RNA sequence: CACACCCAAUUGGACCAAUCUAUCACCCUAUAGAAGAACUAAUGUUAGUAUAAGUAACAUGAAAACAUUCUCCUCCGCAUAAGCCUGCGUCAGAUUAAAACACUGAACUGACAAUUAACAGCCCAAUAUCUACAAUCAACCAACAAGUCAUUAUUACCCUCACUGUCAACCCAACACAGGCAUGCUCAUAAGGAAAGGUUAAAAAAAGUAAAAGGAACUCGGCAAAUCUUACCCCGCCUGUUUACCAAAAACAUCACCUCUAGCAUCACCAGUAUUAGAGGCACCGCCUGCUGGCUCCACGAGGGUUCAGCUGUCUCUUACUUUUAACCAGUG
RNA sequence: CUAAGAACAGCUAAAAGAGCACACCCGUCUAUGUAGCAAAAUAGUGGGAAGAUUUAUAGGUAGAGGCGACAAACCUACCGAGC
RNA sequence: GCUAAACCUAGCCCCAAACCCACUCCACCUUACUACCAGACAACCUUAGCCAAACCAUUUACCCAAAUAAAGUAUAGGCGAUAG
């Protein structure tokens, strides 16, 4: 037994560290956890995104349906002064037909040439459950949200994130609140190609439809390149030919999936959403 | 000659957990239809094995008594006889040795 | 000396909801200082890892090492208390999860070699773990076949990237 | 190199090889079932079938009475030789022991073998037995046999 | 090389403490009922005859 | 963009872990003081555990009713002495490593029991006084090395059988060690024992047996083995002695010879006296020689060489079989 | 070295530090063994074995020494100077 | 998860103070721990050496009764090492 403290008390941390990696413990909300005031953390969250919220109609943003109904059942037990606190409910539906209507508005400017469904895709993307829920969780949104179970749902998540807009949306107007939808939504389709977000089927038999509409002639494919066809490992590049005029090159595998990629191929083109598109103006309006 | 340097665990393990180190499982095992014990099919089962000789023990014990001592085996053929039954017409003129217990079911008269 | 494997038969689960699938029955037992060699029980061991809890018993009855008897020992007394404590339907159904062995505390003698010379002898002994699991035993790994070669093969020519570059 | 070898090297020579195989023989003949390893016990399974053959010659026949005054060793059992297993095999011309392999024996997990000789007043030993004539496959032989036979007989 | 493993404890009684003590054990209830009760057979029809 | 931030020995600095103390501090800190104040290295010390390695090595004659019987060995056995000190008697044991085993498991632990004197040991009143003549069948004979056994007188004295040793599978060798161990009988046993755990029958290795034709052609050397065998030379006279654990000899000692010293007693020499004693050389004898030196020669030798004949696997030229080992299975390790 | 004891078949021979040859003592040659059964042993082959023999018991000589048929041997398993 | 790893006392060290112990019965210098017979036997005497002097040969510190100082001074010494 060594006489001394500090070398047993720093072991005592270390193996503490090793306690939670072997047995970690449940997640807790940031409330429950100490240096925590709503009051002060909410202030902030309207200063670190730079615009003059409401500080009335944004607690009111975080406030969900269930938790009112679970906080209620509390007091029940205890037989315990009434509680006015509303929803998020309200705001949620001005910010969700807000935030299609505009997101509608800066791609069909953007893309005149996208049809309405693929326009439509794009916005249900781009306000989406995944694309919405991983905005929100990187902006102190789900710190804030006053929710019944932890974690928040992703469902719960992407509805409290569009009461932030309709606070946002009464408070700053339509103008303002069009550029946070421009600059954290629009933000979420950089590097993503067309079909990655707007995924479909049978591209070329959709490619046919839109060289009707333009009185086109039906494309034809054929073979431009070709390496290794007996192989397990060939390379084709089918092009498609409308009036013996290239519009699209498509590279693959096997026959089949390089005509499949060269549809893709030309309806990028048709849509103008290709890789050489310039990059959206993020600059203030002028 | 000295090893020039210490095998390594790993080394070892190769070694040791050789399939070649390891035992083969035996695929010759099945039930005896009499007892359900399990045996081997070229094997006789231990526990019928047993039961015989625990059998043969008791009866070569009666013998004892009846020779009462060494270098006095008879020159007529021994029967050997249960609880209820007597001698039959080709055990005349043999031993017959006596046994206080009934006649084991897997034991057939003869 | 620790005794983790008697203490991780008496843990107790919360009860589980209608819709939560059975939970299979896991029973830990062990025999400490055992006279064997810790090495030699390996290979007893070994053999019966993952096997049914009758297939187990086959395989060590007809097995001429001195632990096979000892092993056999330790799941028929595993395979009743599974029954009598462990709320098991079947005892049959019970299968090896976990079957290994462990150093245990040795004792250390002289041999005496030629010319005044000696050795240090130790009496060897060694702890066998058993866990038993209820259910029937998980299908052995197929052997990987030429189509899992080659969709494996062209997957990592699939994510190969330009390297040191944009 | 052991090409044609037929007796194998036991005891201590080939002397001691004789001895032990004598002694085997000796307690064969008077218990008429021993337990002893595989390897003596087959090995001395040619000595007790030739040692009847001796005793149907007839305890008359100078020659045969050497043979068992010297394979057995109690003098006892000498006359039990001509006069119990000799007339017992005298329809038989062979096969009179069988050979039957036991479990090892925990002292050093030999291989064990019984062999004893046949029509002893001992009980039976749990002979194993082929699969019934009415099994499934026994069956689909004995309707095959049938049709055969009855083709043959048209 | 003369060490030996500490294997000697031995098997002894539990019933009785030791013999000639002053100190004898404290019972709060005794082992079983002084007279046994036997309800009269058919009391379960009574439950329902409440009266 | 940053900038003290790539030399041995040595030298100058700036920081500093932990500890104790003063005062703070109070999830482990501050400023000071003090000191057993910091280890990838000394064939370091102690302890744990690997590697070689589950390797080397170790062990139990057979059948059986576990009554008994069989096979084989016996160069051992029994007793006393000495030594050891309860160390295979009974019972029980959560028992459980004696180099395998083990339930009755047992050469382990605990308890209980035991070896009974006639044998052996433990002896004796005083004072004087006695005791030339071997032993060896002791009779012949023949010795030298000259030897292993005895009382009387007077006085005193007539109480009685205590005490201790007594076991065993045993002692000295670190061990249940192929060793060491006095005497009396048995001289093959009337007593005491077991070389093989099972299997297989590879190499290599050890021991043994047999071999065509040849018979030392092998080899430093007829070493080993076989056979039962002649003639010499060198050295040492011979028996004997020595380097316990690499040298048994030509070395040492040795009768015989020779040199030197000593004229005498109460502890060696010596209870002796120059035909003696001591210190030495040489190695008998015989011959020869000087006034000490050289040859010859009988036997003898686990000395060193040589040789006839025989003998033989030493070899030309190896081969077969058996046993141990071996390899595999089980236990220990 | 002292004291007082013991042992040595049989045969040939003769009153023998004679011969052969057991017990016994010694350790010539070869092989095995080399952390071995053994910090010097085993098997066979050998020298002596009535004597300057072998051996049990007790006592004596102690390190600037003892003892020694001198091998610089031995004096409790490292003696050119014990521990 | 086995083997293990951790622990705080037992006690000890250095001072102060004060000068310590040894007959219950029996046995104990003979072969100690042995009830019980003529002995005559009796104790005292410089330390050396390693080491230093770069060998070694003269020499080379070892509490002698008050801390300090005189003083490492007078002296001693192969007039060297060193001692005092
Ligand atoms: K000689
Ligand atoms: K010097
Ligand atoms: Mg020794
Ligand atoms: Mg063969
Ligand atoms: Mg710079
Ligand atoms: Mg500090
Ligand atoms: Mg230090
Ligand atoms: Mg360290
Ligand atoms: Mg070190
Ligand atoms: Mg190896
Ligand atoms: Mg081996
Ligand atoms: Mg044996
Ligand atoms: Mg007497
Ligand atoms: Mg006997
Ligand atoms: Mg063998
Ligand atoms: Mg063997
Ligand atoms: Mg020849
Ligand atoms: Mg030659
Ligand atoms: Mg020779
Ligand atoms: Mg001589
Ligand atoms: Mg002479
Ligand atoms: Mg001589
Ligand atoms: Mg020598
Ligand atoms: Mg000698
Ligand atoms: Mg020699
Ligand atoms: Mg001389
Ligand atoms: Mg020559
Ligand atoms: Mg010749
Ligand atoms: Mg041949
Ligand atoms: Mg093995
Ligand atoms: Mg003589
Ligand atoms: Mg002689
Ligand atoms: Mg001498
Ligand atoms: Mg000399
Ligand atoms: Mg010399
Ligand atoms: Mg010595
Ligand atoms: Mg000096
Ligand atoms: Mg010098
Ligand atoms: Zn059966």
């Given amino acids: 037994v060594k006489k001394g403290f500090r070398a047993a008390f720093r072991f005592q941390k270390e193996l503490e560290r090793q306690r939670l990696l072997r047995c970690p413990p449940p997640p807790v909300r940031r409330s429950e956890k100490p240096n925590w005031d709503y009051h002060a953390e909410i202030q902030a969250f309207g200063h670190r995104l730079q615009e003059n919220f409401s500080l009335d109609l944004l607690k009111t943003a975080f406030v969900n349906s269930c938790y009112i109904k679970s906080e209620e059942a509390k007091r029940q037990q205890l037989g315990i002064v009434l509680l006015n606190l509303k929803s998020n409910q309200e705001l949620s539906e001005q910010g969700t037909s807000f935030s299609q209507t505009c997101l509608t508005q800066f791609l069909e400017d953007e893309y005149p040439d996208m049809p309405t469904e693929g326009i439509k895709n794009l916005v249900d993307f781009l306000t989406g459950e995944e694309v919405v829920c991983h905005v929100a969780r990187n902006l102190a949104v789900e710190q804030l949200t006053l929710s019944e179970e932890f974690p928040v749902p992703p469902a719960v998540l992407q509805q409290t994130f569009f009461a932030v807009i309709g606070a946002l949306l009464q408070s700053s107007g339509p103008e303002r609140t069009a550029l946070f939808i421009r600059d954290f939504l629009i933000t979420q389709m950089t590097g993503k190609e067309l079909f990655e977000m707007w995924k479909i089927i049978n591209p070329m038999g959709l490619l046919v439809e839109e060289l009707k509409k333009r009185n086109v002639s039906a494309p034809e494919s054929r073979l431009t390149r070709q390496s290794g066809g007996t192989t397990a490992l060939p390379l084709y590049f089918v092009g498609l030919y409308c009036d013996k005029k290239l519009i699209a090159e498509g590279p693959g595998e096997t026959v089949l999936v390089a005509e499949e990629e060269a549809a893709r191929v030309a309806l990028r083109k048709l849509y103008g959403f290709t890789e050489n598109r310039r990059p959206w103006n993020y600059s203030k309006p002028k | ?110 | 000396i620790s005794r983790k494997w008697e203490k991780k038969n008496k843990i107790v689960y919360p009860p589980q909801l209608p819709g939560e699938p059975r939970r299979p029955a896991e029973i830990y037992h062990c025999r400490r200082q055992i006279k064997y060699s810790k090495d030699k029980m390996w290979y007893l061991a070994k053999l019966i890892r993952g096997m049914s809890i009758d297939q187990a018993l086959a395989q060590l009855e007809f097995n001429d090492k001195k632990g096979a008897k000892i092993i056999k020992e330790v799941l028929l007394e595993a395979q009743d208390m599974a029954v009598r404590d462990h709320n098991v339907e079947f005892r049959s159904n019970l299968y090896i999860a976990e079957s290994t062995s462990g150093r245990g505390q040795c004792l250390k003698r002289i041999r005496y070699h030629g010319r005044g010379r000696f050795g240090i002898m130790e009496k060897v002994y060694c702890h066998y773990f058993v866990k038993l699991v209820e259910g029937p035993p998980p299908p052995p790994e197929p052997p990987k076949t030429a189509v899992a070669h080659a969709k494996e093969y062209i997957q990592q020519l699939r994510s190969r990237t330009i390297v040191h570059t944009l | ?154 | 090389t003369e060490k030996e493993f500490m294997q000697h404890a031995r098997k002894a009684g539990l019933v009785i403490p030791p013999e000639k003590s002053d100190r004898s054990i404290h019972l709060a209830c005794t082992a079983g009922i002084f007279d046994a009760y036997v309800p009269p057979e058919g009391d379960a029809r009574i439950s329902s005859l409440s009266k």
């Avoid at chain 4, 001895?19 to 064969?28: F, K, M, Q, V």
């Avoid at chain 4, 053959?53 to 045969?64: C, P, S």
């Fill in chain 4, 1 to 154: 190199i052991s090409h044609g070898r037929v007796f194998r090297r036991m005891g201590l020579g080939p002397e001691s090889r004789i001895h032990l195989l004598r002694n085997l023989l000796t307690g064969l003949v008077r218990h008429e079932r021993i337990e002893a390893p595989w390897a003596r016990v087959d090995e001395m399974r040619g000595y007790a079938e030739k040692l009847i053959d001796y005793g149907k010659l007839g305890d008359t026949n100078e020659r045969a009475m050497r043979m068992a005054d010297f394979w057995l060793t109690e003098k006892d059992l000498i006359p039990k030789l001509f006069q119990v297993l000799a007339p017992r095999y005298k329809d038989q011309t062979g096969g009179y022991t069988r050979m039957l392999q036991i479990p090892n024996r925990s002292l050093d997990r030999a291989k064990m073998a019984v062999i004893e000789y046949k029509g002893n007043c001992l009980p039976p030993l749990p002979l194993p037995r082929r699969d019934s004539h009415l099994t499934l496959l026994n069956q689909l032989l004995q309707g095959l046999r049938q049709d055969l036979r009855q083709s043959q007989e048209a």
């Fill in chain 2, 1 to 110: 000659a000295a090893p020039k340097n210490r095998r390594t665990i790993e080394v070892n393990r190769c070694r040791r957990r050789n399939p070649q180190k390891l035992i083969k499982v035996k695929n010759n095992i099945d039930v005896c239809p009499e007892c359900g014990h399990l045996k081997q099919k070229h094997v006789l089962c231990a526990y019928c094995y047993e039961k015989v000789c625990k059998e043969t023990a008791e009866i070569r014990r009666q013998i004892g008594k009846q020779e009462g001592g060494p270098f006095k085996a008879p020159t007529i053929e021994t029967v050997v006889l249960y609880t209820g039954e007597t001698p039959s017409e080709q055990d005349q003129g043999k031993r017959i040795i006596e046994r206080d217990r009934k006649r084991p079911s897997w034991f057939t008269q003869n």
